[model samples]
Target: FHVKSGLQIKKNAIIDDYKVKVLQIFNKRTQEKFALKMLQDCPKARREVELHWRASQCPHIVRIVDVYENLYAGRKCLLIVMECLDGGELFSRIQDRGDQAFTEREASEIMKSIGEAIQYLHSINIAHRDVKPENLLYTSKRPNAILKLTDFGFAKETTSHNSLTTPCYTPYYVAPEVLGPEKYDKSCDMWSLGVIMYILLCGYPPFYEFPNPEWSEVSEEVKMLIRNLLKTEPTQRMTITEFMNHPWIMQSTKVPQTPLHTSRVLKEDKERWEDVKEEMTSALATMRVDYEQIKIKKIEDASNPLLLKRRKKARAL
Candidate 1:
């Protein structure tokens, strides 16, 4: 039930991950760069498309301009056409700014954009069951580009179900209940926010805390604000409204502009970050309970070339 099917795909896919293959495309009707994501048109594909299409009304969520019914893998597929988010992923954007100072205020502003997406989704009774840095993308490389969240494979309308029994979640950001056989609800999404925000501030997830200099400047004001998201009990976790209204989030301009170590840490630990993505991809493909297996390796066991080299220089002094 789409308009029609016809767009020119580039020679090869630019994004080829284990679970997805994405291509850059051009519209003959107009000259613009659009991205194409196609999946076998099955029941699961319908949910991802219809739900994401519905959520596209929100600015913080990616816009799906058209859906094309085409043949793929011996089955009809839906080619979801979307604006090419040229800026990059959340962590990639920050890493690009490694030399520059990334402030708490900027981090808060980013959080606000992300928070808005969830705010709208929950209001519409939809839960973006998966929320991670990889899903957060920017429109362009410009200073004022908008950040939008994409990927809705696990997203589901929760109005009727109310609570989701399936433990469909990314390991690093999953809520405690989802880790068990227990049925979970919207709070799992809230838990993702906490995990994401913690990394936004320091370039590392909440559980893998280190005494790295990067953790030095996070304000207790910001620290306590994120605590509400990581609440062990789902009921205790702050609601999206509660989060958007918090002083740190609500009074965004009033927040401190102090520099954080996020950019630098991202630059230094670049390779390990790639490993994190690989771990996440594997985890998402095959659900596993031992999230600890995906954690950053222990500092002592890591060889930590940076620390060891620095220690050698310090010894000379």
Candidate 2:
């Protein structure tokens, strides 16, 4: 790999909704592409690079090849070089299946992969404050492509005398305490784990539960685990060790193969996702904790204009 200005390495730039942009840098080796994230130089950015480097050895965490601090756009910047992952995001991979089957066993396996990343982070007392599908990506497009956790922008370290009190969060997958003035710790990540699993088992985040056909096919054991992960009280939330030790996650090969509604629901809810996300961003910024109950309207009950638009397209198929 060679270092050059963005002018020479120009490819595509990724625009994240609430995060910084990522660039696909050029490589002289002609073997594989490399990715880079540029953040304005600061103590915060330095901490992110340090913490990311610490967790890079874990198989489930994305590898950090190198870091560069230099003058760019006439301002100091921190450039993090990473292995380019082409497998896409966790949900996008599932969505592309297109009428093909997704199974409970697969979901369990994916969740275990995710748990491994968190276990490593938590062991070092670092909270991956943000853990949603977008940050969870694959290394390639192959069926066995390795899933990896990336993006450490919102990540923070915790200690006995210190706790995370900042209101940093993505509208979705945030723990209840983060939305309020309450102090939160690493358990918030556990809440995020529950929401992602909830979406994995079904197609949407869990609120008050029980949508038949989908829920019926899933086992009570998993449902019980969901209960533990989704606990309203952070103290009651399950730990990564507790989560990975469960038979479903620990004994993946033995897990049952119940078909899931995740892909189908994601497809049906696809077009309206942008609209809802926009609504969530503004609402959460204004009313704090009120976003969950208000912005996350039940998709099945009402026929909003956006849902109608998607429904027609879905019916066209």
Candidate 3:
């Protein structure tokens, strides 16, 4: 395969999939490394590139270094070269924080960064249908590393009159409206922000409950922010602008530096966490086939130990 002049394909690809391969490429002259994603020539592939290219200007969103329309293996393809995010995944960074507690203030700061990306997308009438932990990456591992949102495969443009009806989503972060027949807008991203914040604060999602000790110290202010973000009703959900303006997010430094059990809980539930992620992957595949055909299960559907305890407590009240 012929590569663009001055660009050399390096070692194995960082991402290899059925339709595309993302390699670590080197700029011979500059000696700088970048990610090169090659996608087959198609409307879908082109759309992904266009959207990502437009959104690249946002500081919190991944920037596209260059794009090449080239022919390879007797077929046309798009080679998208982007800045290498060497820091790694967002949650992985948090999980690696050994003894230092991931504090509320830090969580607020992270969410605010993610919110900025969503805000920029919404301002342009774009909805990132897929927003989750896997798509959030850090530019570098340094303390000042910038977190960015990547992946535009499921992104689509929407307007006030024309909303998004496709059920494209990653299961765990999907908004409730997406499960129903309602046409959703950028509000779906808000729901994802809520789920991410919830996990960041306590190392688990609001979809399930845990012992009171896990959340006893989490202030009501932060919890209220999560609730607003996760509202089952799409129209009722907080907008990205509102989320950014929230005191917890806007004045992140003022949020208490309360030490959280996030890393500990994540470590303890490692196995279960893998199972849950696997389930979410399977569920997302199922959703794509026939959204209506799938049974909708809310957090209250199963009577787990945590849910049962909460139910009993509510009944007594």
Candidate 4:
């Protein structure tokens, strides 16, 4: 039966929070291996496949091999075949850098690669609503491996006049505008790039300042870049073209190669890392529901220690 399909299903791999199962599959004629994502046929699944396909042309984005419509356990499903990225997730790669220091210059280069994907998407008026580390992967574990962006589950199309209203997002990477009543465009991606760059340089998020030595060696230019990207107002955020043209990004090699504290911090926080990821997952679902269906918490009501502290500080002033 497998031979008839010109493909061999090898084994079950990881299952995502959405209950989508990924399988290892091999092509018979070319002897190429691929990652097959099996999702039940639905509007969300269809949107994911369609948008991912449209954005696959970018070199920094994951390539889709083929999509198959099939029946699984007597239910209809969409089987998406994509190139297997063996290097693993973005943060995992940084965490595996044992004694070697991940450098600021390296982080700049990495951000440039991510920007390429965003540039391509925004050029075509598509917004990759979710742009977190887990969705970024490397082609292989080699030192020169190419980083590619994946997962288009929350991707949406926009225009010059119209803006995106859905609040779908992962917490740590979400822009402040996404949490408000205002409509946003592709600028949200730039905000996520800031969060990622911040973590890449110091191995932790700006959710709150730890006053640690990790950020001591980071350059102010890079810091300023992050500040611009994380602006509260989406319209005030840096554009993709501006991001690519930033001195730090454009002259990545010229940036200092100072070692970062990313690997160590990530390893030390390993226990709580899963909890952080879970919070983001839950936040995404929470934001996806209709605004009227759920009670919205104001910024002052946010339970994050950083936000609570800031709010108290403001009240005192």
Candidate 3: where is the Cα deviation over 4 Å? 1-21, 161-183, 208-217, 279-317
Model 2 worst lDDT window (10 residues): 9-18
Question: Per-residue alpha-carbon lDDT of model 1 for 1-317, expressed as tens digits?
Answer: 45543343333322231123668776654656888787877767876687888777788989887766666667777778787798898887778863688887888898889888888998878877777667879998888889998888787656533332344557587444334212244676776777666666666654435335335444665565465455444644666777888888888867889877778876887888887666555534443232246667787677677989987998999
What are the RMSD figures for all models against the true structure?
A: 14.6, 14.9, 13.5, 11.9
Please report the TM-score between candidate 2 and the true structure. 0.72
lDDT of 3 by residue, 1-317 (tens): 33323433233332332123568766655767688778886877877788888777789899887776667779877778888898898887878767888887888788878888887888777777676667789998787788887877777776643332444557586444333222355556665677566666666665635337435345575565455555454654676777788777787788888888888889776777777566544533433322235565787676588889889999998
Q: How close is candidate 4 to the true structure, as a TM-score?
A: 0.74
* Residues 154-264 of candidate 4: C-alpha lDDT, one tens digit per residue: 777666443333446575875443333223556566656775666665656666353253354445754654554554456556767777887777777788887777778
The residue-by-residue lDDT of candidate 2 on 1-317, one tens digit each, is 34433212222322221133888766544534778888887878888788887767788899877676666777777777787788898888887787877888888888888888888888777777776666889998877788988988767776533232334557586544333322255566776677667667666544436557345345565565565555455554576777788787888867878777778877777866555444433432333231136566577887789999999999999
Question: What's the lDDT of the predicted structure labeled candidate 1?
Answer: 0.69
Q: Which scores greater on TM-score, model 1 or model 2?
A: 1
Ranking by TM-score: 4, 3, 1, 2
Model 2 misplaced regions, further than 4 Å: 1-20, 29-31, 160-183, 213-217, 225-228, 275-317
Model 3 whole-model lDDT (C-alpha atoms): 0.68
lDDT of 4 at 208: 33
Residue 112 accuracy (lDDT) in model 3? 79
Estimated TM-score for each candidate: 0.72, 0.72, 0.73, 0.74
**Candidate 3 lDDT for residue 242:** 70
Error of 1 at 276 (Å): 2.9
